Write a protein that binds this ligand. Structure first.
Ligand SMILES: *[B]1(O[C][C][C][N]C([N])=[N+])O[C][C]O1
Ligand SMILES: [Ca+2]
Length: 223
């Protein structure tokens, strides 16, 4: 997250870190047994780390739970990143407490200008790189579909929303992929892509979660 702030410890209790030797992607706890993330984050083995704030220190709230099943959306396009969504079933249920909690799926798609919270452990620099130990947070509005498509002519599918600031300076970045965009207590976005990070007129592009409620419920009932 570039241009954000360090979240209060454990204030984003649905945020997970996906770990394969190190942190490589974010995800969102949506059921005691399931995490939603970005299909482009796929690996065949993943440890899910819940209740993290400092991914470099054991602070006593962590639950480390291996993935038992990893299911990419059947229409995920690895090139365009259309349908950039996957579900991870935990090998044992997360225990839900103040620091490890589910986030709701969308009632409806978020209107333009809806305020959200974006989080993760991705790069904090727009010049160079710095990877944080502490979870970063960013307040950001959903952008109009017109703004989104004007920034990325021909590239925004119906499964993509833009969230952020057309001026630059405030965006998600590499290592945030798969993590949450939460607006009014609902998961509306998954960190997906952007052209570099925090550039002028290149806002962050996020998987449009409100399109996937059927798929997610279907997948949970089937597995
Ligand atoms: B993923 O990259 C996310 C980049 C988001 N960029 C942006 N909002 N301008 O994180 C690790 C793998 O891809
Ligand atoms: Ca920790």
């Amino acid at each position: 997250i570039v241009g954000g702030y360090t979240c209060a410890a454990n204030s984003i209790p649905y945020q997970v870190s996906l770990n394969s030797g190190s942190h490589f992607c974010g995800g969102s706890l949506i059921n005691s047994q399931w995490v939603v993330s970005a299909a482009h984050c796929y690996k065949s083995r993943i440890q899910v780390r819940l209740g993290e704030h400092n991914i470099d220190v054991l602070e006593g709230n962590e639950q480390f739970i291996n993935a038992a099943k990893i299911i990419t959306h059947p229409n995920f396009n690895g090139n365009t990143l259309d349908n950039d969504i996957m579900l991870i079933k935990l090998s044992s249920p997360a225990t839900l407490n103040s620091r490890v909690a589910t986030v709701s799926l969308p009632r409806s798609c978020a209107a333009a200008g809806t305020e959200c919270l974006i989080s993760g452990w991705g790069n904090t620099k727009s010049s160079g790189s710095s990877y944080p130990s502490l979870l970063q947070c960013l307040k950001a509005p959903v952008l109009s579909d017109s703004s989104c498509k004007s920034s990325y002519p021909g590239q925004i599918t119906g499964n993509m929303i833009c969230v952020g600031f057309l001026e630059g300076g405030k965006d998600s970045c590499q290592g945030d992929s798969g993590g949450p965009v939460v607006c009014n207590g609902q998961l509306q976005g998954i960190v997906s892509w952007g052209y570099g990070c925090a550039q002028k007129n290149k806002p962050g592009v996020y998987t449009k979660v409100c399109n996937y409620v059927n798929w997610i419920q279907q997948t949970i009932a089937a597995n």
